[PDB]
Design an enzyme around this catalytic site. Structure first.
Site, PDB file in Angstrom:
ATOM      1  N   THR A  28      34.000-103.602 -34.811  1.00  0.00           N
ATOM      2  CA  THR A  28      34.210-104.751 -33.947  1.00  0.00           C
ATOM      3  C   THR A  28      34.489-104.281 -32.529  1.00  0.00           C
ATOM      4  O   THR A  28      35.357-103.436 -32.318  1.00  0.00           O
ATOM      5  CB  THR A  28      35.392-105.583 -34.479  1.00  0.00           C
ATOM      6  OG1 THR A  28      34.992-106.284 -35.665  1.00  0.00           O
ATOM      7  CG2 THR A  28      35.876-106.586 -33.462  1.00  0.00           C
ATOM      8  N   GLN A 101      26.790-106.871 -40.723  1.00  0.00           N
ATOM      9  CA  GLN A 101      27.937-107.083 -41.590  1.00  0.00           C
ATOM     10  C   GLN A 101      28.365-108.538 -41.466  1.00  0.00           C
ATOM     11  O   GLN A 101      28.760-108.971 -40.386  1.00  0.00           O
ATOM     12  CB  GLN A 101      29.094-106.139 -41.248  1.00  0.00           C
ATOM     13  CG  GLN A 101      30.234-106.272 -42.270  1.00  0.00           C
ATOM     14  CD  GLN A 101      31.501-105.545 -41.888  1.00  0.00           C
ATOM     15  OE1 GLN A 101      32.069-105.768 -40.824  1.00  0.00           O
ATOM     16  NE2 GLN A 101      31.968-104.682 -42.783  1.00  0.00           N
ATOM     17  N   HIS A 175      31.046-108.444 -45.834  1.00  0.00           N
ATOM     18  CA  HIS A 175      32.395-107.965 -45.540  1.00  0.00           C
ATOM     19  C   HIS A 175      33.386-108.474 -46.575  1.00  0.00           C
ATOM     20  O   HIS A 175      33.941-109.572 -46.442  1.00  0.00           O
ATOM     21  CB  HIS A 175      32.846-108.344 -44.131  1.00  0.00           C
ATOM     22  CG  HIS A 175      33.986-107.512 -43.634  1.00  0.00           C
ATOM     23  ND1 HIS A 175      34.792-106.782 -44.480  1.00  0.00           N
ATOM     24  CD2 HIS A 175      34.457-107.291 -42.384  1.00  0.00           C
ATOM     25  CE1 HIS A 175      35.706-106.142 -43.772  1.00  0.00           C
ATOM     26  NE2 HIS A 175      35.524-106.435 -42.495  1.00  0.00           N
ATOM     27  N   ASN A 178      39.347-105.429 -46.201  1.00  0.00           N
ATOM     28  CA  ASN A 178      40.281-105.431 -45.081  1.00  0.00           C
ATOM     29  C   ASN A 178      40.970-106.758 -44.806  1.00  0.00           C
ATOM     30  O   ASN A 178      41.237-107.100 -43.664  1.00  0.00           O
ATOM     31  CB  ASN A 178      39.574-104.918 -43.828  1.00  0.00           C
ATOM     32  CG  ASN A 178      38.967-103.546 -44.035  1.00  0.00           C
ATOM     33  OD1 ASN A 178      39.522-102.704 -44.753  1.00  0.00           O
ATOM     34  ND2 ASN A 178      37.826-103.313 -43.419  1.00  0.00           N
ATOM     35  N   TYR A 180      40.067-109.835 -45.110  1.00  0.00           N
ATOM     36  CA  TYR A 180      39.320-110.997 -44.648  1.00  0.00           C
ATOM     37  C   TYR A 180      38.950-111.922 -45.818  1.00  0.00           C
ATOM     38  O   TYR A 180      39.491-111.756 -46.908  1.00  0.00           O
ATOM     39  CB  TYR A 180      38.164-110.550 -43.775  1.00  0.00           C
ATOM     40  CG  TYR A 180      38.678-109.847 -42.523  1.00  0.00           C
ATOM     41  CD1 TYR A 180      39.443-110.528 -41.580  1.00  0.00           C
ATOM     42  CD2 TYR A 180      38.395-108.505 -42.287  1.00  0.00           C
ATOM     43  CE1 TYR A 180      39.910-109.893 -40.442  1.00  0.00           C
ATOM     44  CE2 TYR A 180      38.854-107.866 -41.157  1.00  0.00           C
ATOM     45  CZ  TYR A 180      39.606-108.560 -40.237  1.00  0.00           C
ATOM     46  OH  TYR A 180      40.062-107.923 -39.099  1.00  0.00           O
ATOM     47  N   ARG A 227      31.141-104.227 -48.712  1.00  0.00           N
ATOM     48  CA  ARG A 227      32.310-103.433 -48.369  1.00  0.00           C
ATOM     49  C   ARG A 227      33.537-103.978 -49.076  1.00  0.00           C
ATOM     50  O   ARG A 227      33.750-105.188 -49.102  1.00  0.00           O
ATOM     51  CB  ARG A 227      32.542-103.386 -46.857  1.00  0.00           C
ATOM     52  CG  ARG A 227      33.366-102.169 -46.461  1.00  0.00           C
ATOM     53  CD  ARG A 227      33.347-101.903 -44.989  1.00  0.00           C
ATOM     54  NE  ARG A 227      33.512-100.478 -44.721  1.00  0.00           N
ATOM     55  CZ  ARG A 227      34.100 -99.974 -43.640  1.00  0.00           C
ATOM     56  NH1 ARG A 227      34.630-100.769 -42.726  1.00  0.00           N
ATOM     57  NH2 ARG A 227      34.161 -98.658 -43.488  1.00  0.00           N
ATOM     58  N   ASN A 235      46.472-106.653 -42.988  1.00  0.00           N
ATOM     59  CA  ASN A 235      46.855-108.061 -43.160  1.00  0.00           C
ATOM     60  C   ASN A 235      46.907-108.459 -44.633  1.00  0.00           C
ATOM     61  O   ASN A 235      46.446-109.532 -45.026  1.00  0.00           O
ATOM     62  CB  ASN A 235      45.915-108.994 -42.396  1.00  0.00           C
ATOM     63  CG  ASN A 235      45.992-108.798 -40.892  1.00  0.00           C
ATOM     64  OD1 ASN A 235      47.081-108.712 -40.310  1.00  0.00           O
ATOM     65  ND2 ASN A 235      44.835-108.731 -40.254  1.00  0.00           N
ATOM     66  N   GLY A 317      33.065 -93.875 -38.075  1.00  0.00           N
ATOM     67  CA  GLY A 317      33.469 -94.960 -37.200  1.00  0.00           C
ATOM     68  C   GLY A 317      33.868 -94.492 -35.819  1.00  0.00           C
ATOM     69  O   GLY A 317      33.055 -94.449 -34.894  1.00  0.00           O
TER      70      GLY A 317
HETATM   71  C1  FMN Z   1      37.866-100.498 -33.222  1.00  0.00           C
HETATM   72  C2  FMN Z   1      37.536-100.626 -34.686  1.00  0.00           C
HETATM   73  C3  FMN Z   1      36.804-101.713 -35.132  1.00  0.00           C
HETATM   74  C4  FMN Z   1      36.513-101.844 -36.483  1.00  0.00           C
HETATM   75  N1  FMN Z   1      35.774-102.933 -36.891  1.00  0.00           N
HETATM   76  C5  FMN Z   1      35.390-103.053 -38.202  1.00  0.00           C
HETATM   77  C6  FMN Z   1      34.569-104.103 -38.597  1.00  0.00           C
HETATM   78  O1  FMN Z   1      34.083-104.910 -37.794  1.00  0.00           O
HETATM   79  N2  FMN Z   1      34.290-104.224 -39.935  1.00  0.00           N
HETATM   80  C7  FMN Z   1      34.772-103.329 -40.861  1.00  0.00           C
HETATM   81  O2  FMN Z   1      34.511-103.495 -42.046  1.00  0.00           O
HETATM   82  N3  FMN Z   1      35.530-102.254 -40.459  1.00  0.00           N
HETATM   83  C8  FMN Z   1      35.870-102.144 -39.140  1.00  0.00           C
HETATM   84  N4  FMN Z   1      36.604-101.046 -38.736  1.00  0.00           N
HETATM   85  C9  FMN Z   1      36.923 -99.964 -39.722  1.00  0.00           C
HETATM   86  C10 FMN Z   1      35.827 -98.884 -39.614  1.00  0.00           C
HETATM   87  O3  FMN Z   1      34.581 -99.376 -40.088  1.00  0.00           O
HETATM   88  C11 FMN Z   1      36.166 -97.631 -40.420  1.00  0.00           C
HETATM   89  O4  FMN Z   1      36.364 -97.983 -41.777  1.00  0.00           O
HETATM   90  C12 FMN Z   1      37.418 -96.940 -39.895  1.00  0.00           C
HETATM   91  O5  FMN Z   1      37.358 -96.825 -38.490  1.00  0.00           O
HETATM   92  C13 FMN Z   1      37.612 -95.560 -40.527  1.00  0.00           C
HETATM   93  O6  FMN Z   1      36.511 -94.707 -40.289  1.00  0.00           O
HETATM   94  P1  FMN Z   1      36.631 -93.538 -39.183  1.00  0.00           P
HETATM   95  O7  FMN Z   1      37.845 -92.690 -39.502  1.00  0.00           O
HETATM   96  O8  FMN Z   1      35.368 -92.721 -39.215  1.00  0.00           O
HETATM   97  O9  FMN Z   1      36.832 -94.208 -37.853  1.00  0.00           O
HETATM   98  C14 FMN Z   1      36.963-100.911 -37.404  1.00  0.00           C
HETATM   99  C15 FMN Z   1      37.659 -99.794 -36.948  1.00  0.00           C
HETATM  100  C16 FMN Z   1      37.964 -99.670 -35.595  1.00  0.00           C
HETATM  101  C17 FMN Z   1      38.764 -98.497 -35.112  1.00  0.00           C
HETATM  102  C1  LIG Z   2      38.759-107.150 -35.749  1.00  0.00           C
HETATM  103  O1  LIG Z   2      38.855-105.812 -35.427  1.00  0.00           O
HETATM  104  C2  LIG Z   2      39.979-105.358 -34.778  1.00  0.00           C
HETATM  105  C3  LIG Z   2      38.712-105.530 -35.022  1.00  0.00           C
HETATM  106  O2  LIG Z   2      39.088-104.527 -35.892  1.00  0.00           O
HETATM  107  C4  LIG Z   2      38.697-104.582 -37.212  1.00  0.00           C
HETATM  108  C5  LIG Z   2      37.862-105.592 -37.671  1.00  0.00           C
HETATM  109  C6  LIG Z   2      37.476-105.622 -39.009  1.00  0.00           C
HETATM  110  C7  LIG Z   2      37.928-104.655 -39.900  1.00  0.00           C
HETATM  111  O3  LIG Z   2      37.558-104.670 -41.244  1.00  0.00           O
HETATM  112  C8  LIG Z   2      38.764-103.652 -39.433  1.00  0.00           C
HETATM  113  C9  LIG Z   2      39.148-103.615 -38.099  1.00  0.00           C
HETATM  114  C10 LIG Z   2      39.876-104.355 -33.823  1.00  0.00           C
HETATM  115  C11 LIG Z   2      41.016-103.894 -33.181  1.00  0.00           C
HETATM  116  C12 LIG Z   2      42.255-104.439 -33.488  1.00  0.00           C
HETATM  117  O4  LIG Z   2      43.384-103.985 -32.848  1.00  0.00           O
HETATM  118  C13 LIG Z   2      42.359-105.439 -34.443  1.00  0.00           C
HETATM  119  C14 LIG Z   2      41.220-105.896 -35.091  1.00  0.00           C
HETATM  120  C1  4KS Z   3      37.906-104.294 -30.106  1.00  0.00           C
HETATM  121  O1  4KS Z   3      38.544-105.059 -29.148  1.00  0.00           O
HETATM  122  C2  4KS Z   3      39.334-106.123 -29.536  1.00  0.00           C
HETATM  123  C3  4KS Z   3      39.717-106.256 -30.864  1.00  0.00           C
HETATM  124  C4  4KS Z   3      40.507-107.325 -31.257  1.00  0.00           C
HETATM  125  C5  4KS Z   3      40.919-108.263 -30.321  1.00  0.00           C
HETATM  126  O2  4KS Z   3      41.701-109.327 -30.709  1.00  0.00           O
HETATM  127  C6  4KS Z   3      40.535-108.135 -28.992  1.00  0.00           C
HETATM  128  C7  4KS Z   3      39.744-107.063 -28.602  1.00  0.00           C
END
Ligand code: FMN
Ligand SMILES: [C]O[C@]1([C]OC2=[C][C]=C([O])[C]=[C]2)=[C][C]=C([O])[C]=[C]1
Ligand code: 4KS
Ligand code: 4KS
Ligand code: 4KS
Ligand code: 4KS
Length: 348
Positions: A28, A101, A175, A178, A180, A227, A235, A317
């Site tokens: 995200t 996703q 998805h 996590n 959701y 996933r 949460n 990630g």
């Molecule tokens: C900034 C950020 C945004 C993420 N957004 C999602 C997301 O949209 N959907 C999801 O299933 N996981 C999300 N994750 C979790 C990542 O897909 C991943 O599981 C996690 O970062 C661990 O992998 P890594 O150690 O290689 O970063 C997010 C993680 C981070 C740090």
């Molecule tokens: C939403 O995102 C955030 C976005 O992240 C995530 C998503 C989904 C999943 O699964 C995980 C993670 C970003 C950043 C913060 O701080 C919160 C939330």
């Molecule tokens: C990844 O950047 C953001 C993630 C979550 C949010 O509520 C606002 C910004």
């Protein structure tokens, strides 16, 4: 040392073959336009990561009451479909592949984003706190969905999957992780229902399986991944009874012959009591088809894990945010920049 196995071709199934074992994890970014349409900056962002065997897009909302964070893209309007088509065309032009996703945030949604409507969840159990990086958007007590709400949600997941075809994705990662919406049905903290969607493992798994089946009916099993988070702690309060839900769910999922199951965790080196060890090892013990591991892996430790049959594909990630050229750098044994949260301010 060597990570040669990360560059093995991997046949997911008869429809899709990946050029390597490296996935871009869903991340995200909150950089869509105010109409939740992917921007041309997002097109460039994904396009430059097309050396990944498969990109999983950032979580993408299926309808307005799914929104819980600012400027997260949707895939329910024609404009959003057109925006995503630019993304997928660009990825494909670069020799990549991409799954969207599909997201509903459930009790983690916030009415600020959709005109004050009801936040929906399995039960009227509010999470603590407020939306990150926003002013005073305190989470609210959700309405416990009725069976009619549930039927509409399944319908809307299915419609989103139809739209995914028009948007030119190769497939969908559902998805289910996590904390959701789907994950909320799978855990006792969030699901205190006493109807056919609560109580027992079969009942708590019902929503997840209805969504999976509805989406398979639209795009096919070869184009459908899921996933999951058998653990808690995003949460989601833990419950010692959650594990038996996944004990039931995983073999049911195997019947669907999905493209993959993907774990959603931040550090897979953590051992969880309720799972008898790490998340990936728990899933690997209860599921015998393609598995995507994730969470604080380096190329080196992921390669070792795959060599040891712990899982089949590695999602990356944070290093993919810090290093758009992650794949080429790993291929050439070059130095990788460490990720920092400050990097989220820039879409590169
Ligand atoms: C900034 C950020 C945004 C993420 N957004 C999602 C997301 O949209 N959907 C999801 O299933 N996981 C999300 N994750 C979790 C990542 O897909 C991943 O599981 C996690 O970062 C661990 O992998 P890594 O150690 O290689 O970063 C997010 C993680 C981070 C740090
Ligand atoms: C939403 O995102 C955030 C976005 O992240 C995530 C998503 C989904 C999943 O699964 C995980 C993670 C970003 C950043 C913060 O701080 C919160 C939330
Ligand atoms: C990844 O950047 C953001 C993630 C979550 C949010 O509520 C606002 C910004
Ligand atoms: C499925 O929900 C929606 C679909 C389309 C739309 O323009 C607004 C909402
Ligand atoms: C994402 O689902 C599909 C994509 C392409 C296709 O030809 C059929 C289904
Ligand atoms: C490193 O970026 C993040 C990691 C974890 C989290 O809950 C929110 C942001």
């Amino acid at each position: 040392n060597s990570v040669e196995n990360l560059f093995d071709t991997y046949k997911l199934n008869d429809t899709i073959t990946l050029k390597n074992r490296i996935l871009m994890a869903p991340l995200t970014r909150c950089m869509a336009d105010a109409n939740l349409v992917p921007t041309d900056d997002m097109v460039a962002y994904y396009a430059r990561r097309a050396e990944a065997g498969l990109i999983i897009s950032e979580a993408t909302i299926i309808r307005p009451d799914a929104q819980g964070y600012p400027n997260t893209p949707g895939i329910f309007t024609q404009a959003q479909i057109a925006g995503w088509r630019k993304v997928t065309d660009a990825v494909h032009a670069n020799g990549g592949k991409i799954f969207v996703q599909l997201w509903h945030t459930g009790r983690v949604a916030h009415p600020h984003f959709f005109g004050g409507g009801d936040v929906l969840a399995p039960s009227a159990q509010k999470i603590e706190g407020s939306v990150p990086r926003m002013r005073e958007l305190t989470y609210v007590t959700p309405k416990a969905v009725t069976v009619e709400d549930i039927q509409g949600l399944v319908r809307d997941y299915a419609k989103a999957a139809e739209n995914v075809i028009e948007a030119g994705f190769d497939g969908v990662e559902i998805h289910g992780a996590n904390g959701y919406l789907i994950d909320q049905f799978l855990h006792h903290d969030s699901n205190r229902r006493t109807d056919e969607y609560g109580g027992t493992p079969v009942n708590m798994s019902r929503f997840a399986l209805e969504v999976v089946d509805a989406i398979i009916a639209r795009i096919g099993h070869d184009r459908t991944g899921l996933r999951i988070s058998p653990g808690a702690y995003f949460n989601m309060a833990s419950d010692s009874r959650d594990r038996v839900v996944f004990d039931y769910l995983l073999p049911e999922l195997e019947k669907r012959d999905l493209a993959f199951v993907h774990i959603g965790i931040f550090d897979d080196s953590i051992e969880f009591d309720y799972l008898g060890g790490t998340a990936s090892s728990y899933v690997r013990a209860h599921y015998g088809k393609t598995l995507v591991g994730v969470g604080s892996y380096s190329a080196e430790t992921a390669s070792k894990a795959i060599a040891e049959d712990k899982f089949d594909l590695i999602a990356i990630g944070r290093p993919f945010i810090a290093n758009p050229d992650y794949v080429a750098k790993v291929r050439n044994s070059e130095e990788l920049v460490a990720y920092s949260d400050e990097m989220l301010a820039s879409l590169i």
